[PDB]
Amino acid sequence: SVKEFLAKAKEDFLKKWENPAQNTAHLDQFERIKTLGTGSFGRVMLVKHMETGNHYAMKILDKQKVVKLKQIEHTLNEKRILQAVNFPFLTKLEFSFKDNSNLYMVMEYAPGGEMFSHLRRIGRFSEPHARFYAAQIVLTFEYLHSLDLIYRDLKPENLMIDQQGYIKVTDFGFAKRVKGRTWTLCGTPEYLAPEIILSKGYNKAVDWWALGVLIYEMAAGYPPFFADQPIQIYEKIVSGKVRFPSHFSSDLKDLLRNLLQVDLTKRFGNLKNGVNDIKNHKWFATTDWIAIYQRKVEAPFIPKFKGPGDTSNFDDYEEEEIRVSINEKCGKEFSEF
Amino acid sequence: TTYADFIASGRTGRRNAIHD
Ligand SMILES: NCC1CCN(c2ncnc3[nH]cnc23)CC1
């Protein structure tokens, strides 16, 4: 059963969680090819592992920048979790290491680019197209939540398309293993649950609210709560009044009403029957959950490819040195990494 | 239209995370 699959996955996870892999490679084992994305502590690059010729995505964080941004514990969360998970729609760590200046995490490369890019270009996804992605997220969250993990940054920018048109949920920077409630103000304005905005203790139900935002955005082409400044976005979210495009099917609206529910006692994914209230909603009635998990379903969109390290599905970013100081920075802070 | 309001907004690009 699902319960059986998940208990076994938890046994697997905890072994790695309690005894994390550390220092399993070094920088010069990799050829750096291109920056695929950037962020507050550095970037993610396409790299080639020389010994195998395999391509990977290497995330590089500047330790000093992590420290300035007060993201030390969050970064340690990211690495410790990613080395420990294993799931079809996640990119676990193949390798990690650090040097005087940086932290390095090496993961499976998803060559299809960000969902964000395709969603914006095309405008919006059909309900079947949105459902294919949504199913994969539902399953990932099922997996993650069973391990007492909250993800906390679902959005198109953070969903990578693979060669088969399936998803990888990347960007574990805010992911946290927590039983019960937590309090950090984090996430992305458009996707923040009202509990977060109202500075309450919250739980994994914030991820299910964020799923409502994503499905809405995929199907509409814009999010349910938007405005030029975050404060105005927060005011809309806490009203919770959502308006649906006329093209939204009856079932879709009903799903979204139950995901984008300000009342935690009624929010889908947070009820006594957990994720099954979502899995068994009418909008997903055509979804074969096992076949999605097995990647047997035919993806509604498959990315245009030229080669194994072709990068044409990514935007171009300015390439910046990877500099390594002769002095070790922030040794204590990142000792366990 | 809502689509037109979105595309004219400053939030159609990649959206940054917030923290504390
Ligand atoms: N949030 C958007 C970023 C785009 C670049 N990234 C990336 N790109 C490709 N394959 C990958 N495997 C793991 N991360 C990752 C990281 C995420």
Taking the CB of residue A73, how many other CB atoms lie within 10 A of it? 12
Q: Which residues of B touch A187 (CB under 8 A)?
A: 17-18
* Closest Cα to atom 2 of ligand 1: A158
A-chain residue closest to B10, CA distance: A228
Closest CA in chain A for residue B2: A222
Considering only CB atoms, A184 lies closest to which of B10, B12, B20, namely B20
Sign of the C-alpha dihedral computed for residues A303, A304, A307 and A313 taken in this order: negative
Binary contact (A186, B14; C-beta < 8 A): no
Which value in Å is the resolution of this experimental model? 2.1
Tell the CATH topology of A20-113+305-335.
Phosphorylase Kinase; domain 1 (3.30.200)
- Please indicate whether, in this complex, the C-beta atoms of B6 and A120 are within 8 angstroms of each other: no
The answer to whether residues A217 and A120 touch, using CB atoms and an 8 Å cutoff, is no
How far apart CA A333 and CA A66 sit, in angstroms, is 10
Length of chain A: 337
Chain A nearest CA to B1, separation (Å): 10
DSSP helix, strand, coil percent of chain A (3-state; round to 5) = 35, 15, 45
Q: Could you tell me the CA-to-CA distances from A151 to A140, A198, A208, A209, A296 in Å, in that order?
A: 10, 19, 10, 12, 26
Distance from C-alpha of A239 to C-alpha of A223, rounded to nearest angstrom:
15
Boundaries of CATH 1.10.510.10 in chain A?
1-19+114-304
- For this PDB entry, the determination method is X-ray
CB within 8 Å of A298: residues ≥ 6 apart = none
Residues having CB within 6 Å of any atom of ligand 1: A 36-37, 44, 57, 91, 107-110, 114, 157-158, 160, 168, 170-171
The one-character DSSP state at A155 is S
User: Which residue from B6, B18, B20 is facing A226, i.e. has the nearest CB?
Assistant: B6
Question: What tokens appear for A281 in the block?
Answer: 């909603």
Helix (H, G, I), strand (E, B) or coil at A296: coil
DSSP A190: G
Q: Tell me how far the alpha carbon of residue A85 lies from the centroid of ligand 1, in angstroms.
A: 17
- Report the C-alpha dihedral over residues A216, A220, A225, A230, rounded to 10 degrees: 110
In whole angstroms, what is the distance from residue A116 CA to residue A152 CA? Answer: 17
Domain with CATH 3.30.200.20 in chain A: 20-113+305-335
CATH placement of domain A1-19+114-304:
1.10.510.10
Supply the DSSP symbol for A90: B
Cross-chain residue pair B19–A186, CB shorter than 8 Å: yes
Question: Residue A53 burial (CB < 10 Å; 0-12/13-18/19+)?
Answer: exposed
